[PDB]
Structure formats: C-alpha cells, structure tokens
C-alpha cells in the first residue's frame, strides 16, 4: 500500500515505546488478538475494524488484516524493525488473550499500567487511551528520584518539565496529591552538587507562576549546583525559594553552590519575596568571585522575608534589596564573607518618595570573620529594629547612617572598624562592645533628614545617655534619709570614686528639718534658725592633686548641721553628714563632672552606704561656706561665721563723710535695725 | 433475621476485569464452615425489582450474562448476615474461602456509593476514588466492618448493618477534603468543618479542623455554647507569612463564621474575605465566648473586606497575634472584652501581645478594640489610612515601633500605662494618652514613659545615682581659653535657656587649711557658672553669674538670627573638668517638628569681633528685698527705705563682724525709734 | 529425589538459599494456586538449559540431607510439606535461578541472584529470617512489631554485607533488607521499633535512631511520632559530638505538644548528651514526682568548650530533677516553655572553669513566652553569671523560688512574678527592665549580697516603668525641659492652678521651680543693672517650697532675675492634698514647671506621691492661703535672706562696741541700694 493511500489525519497510535512501557511478563508470555476499531462501538464487532497500517523504519506502509496477533515473536519483530501502527487517533481498541478473555474493551480511546524508566522515554510513549496510568521510575535514567504516577491524555498541554510531559499529540500529567510537596527533583534537579539545577529551578518557577501555585521554587534536602538564574525585567507578585522544610534552627538540610560567574545566583523582580532554609557556599576562599545569593530589582515597594540562612565564603553581596517596605531576616549566620551580607538601597523615584528603606527587622544573627565588605549595608533605614545580634572578628560591621533603629542586645567583638551610624536615630539597650569595637553615631558625612530630627538615646544598666530633651513630673532620690528624733544623727552618705584628678561632685541633700505648722504665723527674722518652709544642704567635693577636699552650704531650714569627709585614696572619698533633728525626709541628688561608664571602664561611682555611722578620728571637717557672685562683686559666708561681702572699694576723698545720707530697714541677726549709707561726692 | 448480603454496588466495587471475564461458582454456607462442602450450604433468596423472594440452587453460577441481568433488575441476594462464603472460577481454583465473614481488590467512585456497598467480609479492602463523584479529592483506602459504628462523615461511613473505616497512617494529615469539602469557593464546606470538629472532639485528636489549600465557602458554624477544652482551626500548613494558601468566603448572614467556646483557641494560615465592599454585612471570622479565662494564638492571618468584628475574645488570660493583616475592614479587627459586670474578678484582659501586623484602609470600626489590657505588648505594627486605630484605654502596654500614618482620629489611650519606643506619627496621626472618661485603676497607677531617639518624656518620677554631662571641657594650662559651647535654636520669641557650667577652676590642696576671706578668688572647693540666654523680640540677649571658684571668666554671644544664638565661654586657667548641663523653656520634638536644638560645638574658638559681651550679673530676691551684682562690679541691695526722722541718727546702736573684700571689718547699724 | 547425603559431604560455602519464610513471604494467592518448576543453576547461565543445573540438597525436619532432582516441582502440596517439615533447600549462594509455571511460561530467568512477585512480611523478626530470592528483590513489611501496623514499609533485599541498625537495615545470616526512604526527614522512632503505648521502653529505638543518624550524618537525629512514650535513661555521654536533635510530632500545636515522654525516675536525666549544638522541641515530659518522687530531669548536656541550645514548645509536668542542665553556654534560646508543679530546678546553666577566666559564665540566654506554675523546692531559673541575656513576656506564679540570675546582664520585658514565696535573686545583676509586674508580695532582690563576679565599675541596673524611671548609674541629656510650658502674652498678670500635690507622708517636701522670666523686650545689655528685682535683666525663675506639716501643708517662695511669678497662694484642705496657684507675671512668654520631691514614688509604695497637673487659668478661692515671699542663703552660722514684710535679712557674728573704733568709719565700698549708687560705711576692729 502507498503513501497517499492513508486517510487524512491518521497518526502513529502504537510504537516500540508501547512494547517497552508494559511489564516484562506481558511482552514475553502474552498471546492474544488486538482490534483497532471505529470510535463509539466495540472494535471486535462486525464492520467496526478501521484501516491499520504497519510502517517499518525504512518507510514500508503495508495495510495489516485484523485481528492483529500479539506474541513475543511479533513484539520482538515490531521493536527490531522500529515499526509503528498508523490509524485514526479517534478509534476504539479491544484486546483479548489466546483463550477469548477480554483484557480491555475501549469504544473510544479519546474519552474515559506498566513502568517507564525516564522523562526522555515518557515524552516518546503515546498513551493507549485517555486516562491510561503509567509509573515513571525516575526523572533521569535510573536515579530513583523525581518519579511518580502519571495519567495519559490526547488533549493539547505544553511540557513544563515537571507536572506536564508532552510528546507528538499527547502528554502525561503527574498525579499530585499535595501540590505543596513537589520539589526540584520533579523538575529534573539532582542532589549531586555538580549537575546544573538552574533549568529545573527556572522550570519550577514558570510552572508556579502559570498555575498560580504559591510553593514556587522548593529544594529537597542535599547539595545543589546552580548557575546564575535571571527571571529579570518582568515584575511578578511572588518569588518564594525554600530549602528542606525541617525545624533546623542552626544548619539547613539544603546547600547551594555555584561557579561565581553571575553577580547573583537569583536575579528576581517581585513585590513579595520569601527565602528560607538555605546554606549558600560562595567558595570565594578557594575560587574568589563577586557572586551573591539573591538580588530583588522590583522598584516602588518590596516586602522581604528571610529565615534560617547561612552565608559561607560569599564574595558578592549575599542579599541586595530595593525600595524595602517591610524586611524581616531572622536566624541568619555569615562566615568568612568578603562582600556585603545584608544590603538594601532605593530607586530614588520621586513618587512614593522612594529615597530610603522602611521596616528592616534583623534578629538572632551571627556574623563571623567577614573581611572586605559590610555585614550591614543599610543606610536610610527608617522604623527599623535589631534584636540579639553578634558581629565578631568582622572588619566592617557596616553602615546604618541616617536610619531610625531600635537596637536591643547588639554585640560587636574584635571588629577592626566601627559600625557607621552617622546621623542615625538610635534607641538602644544592652549594647555589648569588646576588643576595641564601637558604634560611630557622630555627625560626619551627609544628613538625609532635618537637624530637628537628629539625636539618639542609649539605655544601659550602668546609666542613660539622651542626645535630646528630658522632662519628668518630679525628680526624687533612690536614697531618702529620716531623723524622727530631736537629736542629730551621723550618716555615711557614700564613697565617691573620682577617676581623674580635679573631678567635682555636688551632693544636694534636698528637704528641710522641722515639719511643725505655723511657718506663716510669724514673719521670718532669723533666716538660719527661723520658721521657714523649704530647705536644702549643698556638699561640694573635688579630687585635688593628692586625695580630695570638701565644702558645704545650705538654704532655709537646713537638713544638715555638719559634714565630715575621709579621703582614704587619691580616687576614693567617704562623705558623712550630721543629719539635723526632726528631718522627716531628705533626698540625696548628685551632680558630677567625672567620666561615666559610656566614656571609660574605670569610671565614676557613688558607692551608696546611707547607713548610721559616726565619722572616725582623722576625718576632716568640711568647712561651712557659700559664695554667690558675678566674678566682680557678690555675697558669701565663712566657717568662722562671718558674712563675706565683695564690691568696688571706695576712696574716702569721693565720700561726703559728714553724716549718713539715708537708711534702709535690715533685720541683722534677730533685730530690725537701720543700715546706714553715705553720699558719693560728684 | 435475614438481610441483603449482595447488591448491584457489589458488582460495581470489584475490578472491571471481573465483570467482563470471570466465570465461577459462588457458595453461601453456615458460619464456622467451608461453604464449598456437602451439608454446609444455607438457603439463598434472589430479590428482583418488583420481584418475589424465590430461591437459587447453589453453587450460584457467575458470568457476564448473570452480572448484567443482576444489575439490570436492581436485584439482591438475601441470606443470614453471619454466613460462610467461598468463590471458585470454573477451573475449580479458590479466589476466597471464608469460614465466617464476621471476623478476619475494588475501587468505588463516591461516599454515596460507599454507604450503599455492603462489604463481602469483615476486613474487606476498597479504594475510595474521591469523597464526591469525579473530583479526584477526599479519597483513600477503606477496611469494611459489620460491627455497629456511627457515620462521622470523614473516617467512618455507615450503611444498614455495615460501615467503612478509613485507613489513616497519620491523623495530622487529615483535611476537610476527607470530610467532604470542595475547594471551589461556592459549595458550603460548613457540614465538613462541623463533621471534622465533632470527630476531633470525640476521638480526642488535637489537629481539630484543618483546611487544605484553596478557597472555601463557609456558612456560619455555631459550635454550641457548651465549654470545650480546645478549638484549633488552620489553613494549608506551608511557611508563607504573607499570603496563606487557604481563603474563606461566606454569605455574611451569621455574626461570625466560627462561634466557639473553648479555653485554648488557635487560628493560623487563613485569609477571610468578608465581601462588605460589594455585599455590605456584619460577619466576623471567629468569636470565643468561653467564660472564666481564654487563651488565643493567631499567626499568618489576612482580613479583607470584613464588616463584622474579625476576632472577638472574652476574659483573655493570654493572647498572641503575630503576622496579621487587615485591608478595607469596616468593622472592629482585634476586639477583647470581659464578663465581670462589676470590678474585682473578670473586669479586664491580660497578656495581649500583637506583633508584625499591618491594618490598611479600615473605616468605621476600631482596628484595636482592647480596653483594660494589662501586662500587654505591641511590637513592629503599622496602622495606615484607618479612621480609628482604636481603644487601648486603661491598659498597660510596652509599645515598640508602632506606626500611625494618615489616621483620621487618634489611638484612644485614656488612663493607659504606656512604655513606648520609636513611635512613628505621620500625616496628622497621634496617640491620645489624656485623662478623659472613666479611670479603671487608682490615680497612683497612672503615668506613661516615652523613650524616643530625640528625647525621653516621663509622666512620673525620675531618680539617678548622679547627673553628669555629654560635654566635659578641660583647661590644663595657666592661660584662659575661648571655647564655643553650642548654637541654641529658639523656635518661639521669649524662649529662655540656662547653661550651667558645673565644675570649678583650681584643683590644688589646702582649700580647708585657711578660712575663706575672698568669696570670689579664695581657696574654695565647689563652683559653677550660670549663663542665661533668652530670645527677645529681635535676636537674643544674655547675662551670667558664678559660684565659688568659677570655671568661667567671661561670656560673649553671637545672635545674627531671630532663632540662632552661638554662646562662647572664656574657660578659666586650671579648670580640670567642666560639665555642661542645660535647662530650656523651648518646645522639644514631642511638641513640634521645628523644635529647640543644642548644636554642640565644644571647640576652641575666639568670639568673632561682632560677638556681644554677656553682662556679669546675679539677682537673688523674694520680689520685695534681695541681693545681687552688676557688670560694673557693685553689690546690689534691695530693702524697705527708711526716713531719717524714724532713726536715732547721732550714734550707731551696734556692729557685726563682716569680711568686706578681703579684710574682717565692723558693719554698723543705727537704731529705729 | 531420594539421595541421602551427609552434612560433611555438602560443598563448602553452600547455605540455605530458600526456607519456609520464603513460602510465607510469597503472596497467599501464589501459595494456594501456583503450579510450575524451579531451577537452581550455575551463576552466569540460564538454569533451565542442559548442563547448567548445580546440586541442590533438601534438608528435612530431623535435619537429614538428600540431593533432589531438578527441575523442582512447586505446588500447594509441596509448599505445605516444605513448611510442615521446617525444610530448607541448601545450594551455592552464588547461583542462577529460573521459575516456569506448569504451562512453560517463565516467571523469572535470573542468571545471577547476586546481580541486579512482591510478598508481605508481618514483623522484622520474620524479615531477619527471610532470605531474599535475589539481589534487589522487593518485600512489604506490614509493621515493625507483629500486629501493630506502625514502622512498616517497602524493603529491597541484598546479599552484600550491612550491619543491622534496627530501623533502615534489618540483616540475617548472609543477607539484609534496606528500607526504601524517599525523605529521611519523614522517618520516626516507629521505624526503629518504638511503641506509642506509654509502657514499652522505647530507649532501644531512641539509641538505634540516634546511632543511625550519627553514622549516616542525617540531621533529623531522634524524631518521635505523636503519642505517649516510656523512655529509660539514655546515655550518649563522654564522646563529644557536633549535633543532638530530639523533637516530638512536628505539627503546629501552640499550647500542648502531641508527644509525651514518661520514665521510671531511676536516671538523673532521661537524656545524657554531649554535643556542641542541641535542639529540643514539641515534647511534654511528665516526671511523675507527685506520685513516685525522684530527681530525673529531661536532658543534661555535658559537652565542654561551648554549648549552643534551642528549645521550643516544651512542657515540664511534675519534674523531680533538673528539667534542663546546660554547661559553658555560648547561645541558649528557650521559647514557649511551661513548667507545672516541678520540685527541682527547671532552666539550669553552669560553667566548667574554676578560675576567673575562659569558661566562668553563660552567654546569650534568651528565655521568651514562658509560664511557671506551683513549682516548689527548686529554682525555676538557675542561671547565675548570664551575660548578653534577655527575658521577654514570662510569668512565674505560686513558685517558691523564681530562682537565681545574680552577677548577670539581662534585658527583662514583661516579666510577671505573682504570689512567689521568695524573691528572684539578682545580686550584682546588671538589669535593663520594662513593665515588671510584681503581685502578692513577689519581688526581685537586685541588692549587693554575696560574691560580685565582675568589677564595681560594671555594676548598676536601669528600670524603665510607665509610672517612673530608676537609674542605678549615670544620667546625661542635651537639656532639661517641662511637660508643662505656661504662656502669658498679656501686660496683665494671670492666675494659674499648677497642680494638686499628693504627699503620702508627714514632712514630705516639694520644690516647684518656675523656670523662665517676665518681659522679652531688647536692651537688657544697654543699661548696667541697678534695680536687682524690676531692672532690665536676662534669665530668672520663681522657686516655690511646699512641705506637708503635722496637719495640712504650708508654702513659701523665692525668685531670681526677672521673676515669672508675682504672687503664690495654696489650698491645703486635707492632710495629703495641696493645690498650688501662681499669679503668672505680665509678658512672661514661656515658663517651664520643674519639680523636686522627698515623697515616696510608685517604686517604693502603692499609695505614692502624685502631681495632679491642672496647669489651667484659675483664680484661687478668697479663702486660699497666701505663700510668704522669703529666701535664705546661709552656711548655718552666717548668710543673707528676705522676709514677706520686704526687709533684707543678714546674719553674722555680733560685735561688742568696746572692740570697735567708733570714732570714724575706716573706709567705704560702692553699693547700689534701691537703685541709687551710695557708699556703705565700715569701722575698724581694735587689735
């Protein structure tokens, strides 16, 4: 029979692949009768057989009489000849064995097992009928990975290299129980750390985008070689990439390795990105390169989610984000990275004012021995947070300049250069700085925001530093002293440690002696021992060239009668006060010029004792003096008990000495007297 | 008590190979016996459609012709349910030989057909293709039983005198598919949810209710009012955090999609789309009304177009809601109330922790309806373009990194004990922490503390070991040095600054080796300079005083702007450490954006010619009498003027020992008559 | 068929190649129905062909051997006799094997069973006794233990040597079966022979799965399925390893894990590990100390030179021993953990180094989202010398000893101690705290008792509360301002009510500083100051003193420079409460209210000091008490002041006329008295 003796639209319905794709027992043992019949009826029935043509590899096109006898001999011959059965794709098919038992009876193959070794063979194996089930042993020949059950179809579907495998006028659909349990194995990846799994990653991403499946790129456990993947230009909504989903906090079960040729292993443009449970070994220690893990190119708002990420020997920028709206990177470790680790920039697009990054939360991270680039390349990060982070033996902790950062429990240890935080609005607790490490929060370089927005607050166990305003309801003391007794009592206030020669302390004993009514019953005549409401004592202490010395003043109804001091060392000064009788509550409030713990390690201390203690023999009386002036004239008092006065001394020659010009009412001691003054000669 | 033992559904169950080909012999004998045997055969009756009971001589011949006819007449074989049964195949082989079908392949398309198929024997296995016909979902392997078990619509499917139990390798891999839910976002999956809940309660399995990935239409599920221990509801368990792989839609008719009453509640990995934007309604997601303590756990939740209260909680002992998003919700989002109609016992909520959330374009309702929340926390939250950020009044809140942008009305925080850091207020948004409305606790509990980068505001007490300065100036030379302290920005006319230069000049011993005679230049311990700066109608003017051994000899100022004033000090020789401590009446960053600044220079710099000298003055009085000094170098005195008439003028009454300038001297006073 | 052969006459290296287990291992349909012929031939040949058959010996019940004639006839009768006689076919383990049915159709044709249908086996006991038919032969294990249908799966046979690991490899005499594992992360202790009955000791399974994961370098380590498991003390001690992971059923249950461990109390810890990295998650441990008292904890890690620890979703019920014991911790995260009625320590961490260097502390301890209830006899937290450490949102209620965090460095947010018998011991501990909730006499002892680990210079705590701030250390700021700035852009003085002062104790002193001045007109540097009160001056303030007396309070106020205040009145109508009014001067553009107090704050007492700020325009009631205008600057002997009558007060040593030269004033000094520059006279003192 000839070439154009074949009906229009007739196709090969059975090939050697159909012999291979049925169990060995069937090939070798089966003997029976095959009927290719008219569609919509039993093919064994009379006048139902449609034309069938045997075609050799040579190009033979002989018509074959039905039923077609099947047996090992005819199978062997069909395979050897690389032959094919051509007939109507719309056909009935019926097979019975040597006896008469119907194996199958399909009236229309277009309308509703055996094993296949590879995808290569699957794409060349036509289904027997619409719904025909097959088992794929493995994606690649004899790797025992990326296999599963497959349902055959004649309907047109494009090969996606994972779920749909298409041949000439047919395809096989992977039977997927849970779509969220597919991996790169299903898309033809191999965990040998050599075979490029980039085609599998590109195939699985395109599949997820088209079929709208959120799992996206899913790595199974093991090591994967990946060449640069550019999904670039086109803005997508989602790019998710996750390693083996197991609860391993430290070491993910998936590792990525590359050739260091692309600037990033993954080049994406997506509004929402999620990357987790991955180790990236950049191999920059042995084959130096500039290859990072992921860059997001999408302008006008990015959302990022990182979790359980290890960057080992990365020469490039590990993560590069753009126009960040919300970035959460938790449980990430960087070891011996020579490039930037966490980098975020802005498009500069005037609209939405994309001239900064927003809501960066970095938590539970450890950067070790990172030399060359910046661990944090995060300038202009507003409404951002750092929680429980360690950066050790890293040259450049990096840049958080012009930012707004809550920083809880950040540790810098043995870092060559400081964390750059120029014009950065920091709000910190428990910053741990060892081995010469520090944070540079100075006003160097360019300020992004107005001068009015500048300042940072540091809240430490050892004190508070506010580069800004303070306001409170009231100022109290940690130490309230009480003398509910008519007799005075000697207390030891504290031992003052003065780290530097010339350091000055002022102890304000705020509060008065007496709490009895009738202070407005009589006018005050005795300014010292009178009946006035209000009072304080002001003790001055300064570390001198050798040891220290003291001097004290008071106001109103003084809470202190006397103060003595003991200068045991050059740095140490014990301060005692004779707490006046009937002193109900006296608050201890201190001013100091001494360096605090923020400045030096061997810093200023107030070793508070606040205990009843008589000053020992060899204690020195702090002289009772005050001195209020303008550097020319003023008023004071001395320890002898004389009022001190200072003013321009006068020549008697310029004074009308004849008699006082006038008088003014002054209450000298207890008595209202008349203070005289003389006229000044013109 | 004979029953139908075989039906048309039994012919359907077995492989199609069997129907078409199988020739054989079927025996039904008495139990505890091989039925293929003389004297073992019990009577078997053939029921037909509109047909008599009749009887059939065993063995029962099986072939295509018989099966076709048997199915045709909707026929059945009637016998004693407790029977022996054996099957041969013309050849005389054994397919199965069962002495008793009472105690120890096939595919079935639907649960409808499964509930109609009687098992051949106890432990007979079949495949369920799908829960619903031709839907490829909710299927599995089932082991048949004659024992009486009730249909639970998921694991056990019951007929008349039989049931089918699902083989479950892991109970935590069951979904609503297995209980007959359809992920088409139209067919009501409420029967499946109710069925899976009832199952999990009775079987005491903790997974409770578990959605697969996809969209599900759910009519209101009211889980009675009786108090349960647990209610867990979860969408597709895949690590996302942004968009859960499970969406819920509804008809908006119930007040909540889930009416629960449990001590411990878990919602996670769900999007609820309320559809108020198109079909206005008042349907929330979940309300828990279990009294006497509640525990809540929310994670990865999206609320889109919710008209009702998204979450309603009662008598909360502990509530954690992390990674939750609300867009275009017209009702309340996070709502928590209490049972106690009077104070004492159940009159508040405890341990509310909201973290990593974003409420956007929520108009009408309160995003946070959380009054009287004690020991509570907010961490990294954003409320943008919302009418009512909500109510946290009479609360106790740690608030880290809360953002309010373009919110019409303030976050109501009346009498609320706030402890805040890095609050971002943009586009006229603010927090009302005032004392309006009812105070829940005592007046002694009130107060908030706001720690910002730009300053600290304490509505309460402060105490510290000692006050130091950010700026310590040193002059370890004999010669005075001109420093520029800072530039002061005074945003309002009249704003007053006072720069206390704490510390003294000189640090040599023997200050208490002689009495103080010269109050200015004497061997003294202690000292300070007090520089006063006020912004006047035009520019600023200054003046300054000192105490003891002054650290400052001179003060000059440069004021070439209404707002700006540079302050310079001539730091005295041998000033080993001088601390700069400032007071100001000027508005800080909490009040205004164009706020007060101290631009610290603290650098050696001579005043630039045009600088004006700050007069050396002090003034201590009561408003009637006092003492002072002026720049000329004169002591000032103020007191009541006396008439010479009222004074005994001829002789001084007495004297007092006064040290004038350097010398001890007698100060006179005349008597008044 | 019947050729009697001696055991000593059987070729060296010949073994039982087929046993009754091989008949039981076939599908039941095969046993009953199959009829055919079996060939055992030389390795590398078709065993059916002439001159390829090797000698096969049938062993009988009594142990006798006869060489059988091939082909070997297979049928139910022969299968029954073979099993009934507990018979075996002995031949060369290296052999070809061929099976035909009675028709002559080949089932197998294997030229060498050592080079690469499917039966079922009830238990591993039976699996270890079943020799594979050939290399790569597939079998289906129903379950690990007979009739439990857990720990079953698909197995592929081999004659290659492999040691039994009791989970993945099950070996017999010259063969083994390897489990088909698609995902090694889906294996559980069921696969290693554990039973979820809470009675049968699953220690062997835990030890087996552990040693497998170590030898195989699989990070999953020990994975429990859901249920209650009985575990005797497991010792993985002495040998220093990298990893120890142990986890219960991995399903997101927030509150109650689906896996419970229960033990006998005989070991000090259920798990004795020595690893650098440790992960415990999703486990309830019921110590049963309430009914059978003991000192058994859950886990101790003894690995020296740095330990990492991650804990999540852990419940400790009735634990008699130390629940968790860590050594030389470098990083410890314990999130979502609960302790109920435990009599021992719960979270314990110590160090190895005796001397004050190297390993003498713990580092980066982060305890979060925890709740300890009714724990009595031990420390909930036994964590001395914990540096760079954090507590976030934790409750300790009705526990005798909240524990020891002394000599530490802690951020503590939202810690609640309620009805705790003893304080949390935090001696010399560097605390940085917010929203600490202490109820029913619970407290934190942050005193300086016992040995201080670090230097005196490192000491101090900061407590930031809603009601106030307490700094045991330095404070510095750019400038002090006020919550309250009062304005009077008006030539007339205006009355304001500042606040109601609540003084909880008799003798409590308040000082209200009204910082700022009256006037803001230029030319204060034009004239020399002559009138110290009303003169053109820059700077100023009013200082208001208020003290609670035996009954009510009384006041008194002084001023500086250009005073912002003209008058002060007050209302003391109770012992505790004092309203303060100020007559704010004309043209005072901004006055900041700043306060000092001796009164006890909220840190000290519940009924604490208050400033009930009003800061509003209000004229004081005619019955209000006027505050006397006074100041008083002295040294206790001499000084200066002013009284409300408007007289300057001076104090100094009195002089007798006899020691004064009354003749002439010795000299004069220039003094500006009431604006006018005059000469203040002075007399000389006789020697």
Numbering used by the authors:
A (entry chain F): 38 to 149, 167 to 736
B (entry chain E): 46 to 149, 167 to 735
C (entry chain D): 34 to 149, 166 to 736
What did the article's authors report about this structure?
WceF has remarkable structural similarity with bacteriophage tailspike proteins (TSPs). WceF is a stewartan hydrolase and produces oligosaccharides, corresponding to single stewartan repeat units.
WceF residues 34 to 736 were resolved in the electron density. The head domain (residues 34–146) is made of two β-sheets containing four antiparallel β-strands flanked by three α-helices. The central body of WceF is formed by a large three-stranded β-helix (residues 236–514) of eight complete rungs capped by an N-terminal α-helix (residues 252–265). The intertwined chains then again separate and individually form a β-sandwich domain with a jelly roll fold composed of eight antiparallel β-strands arranged in two four-stranded sheets (residues 531–667).
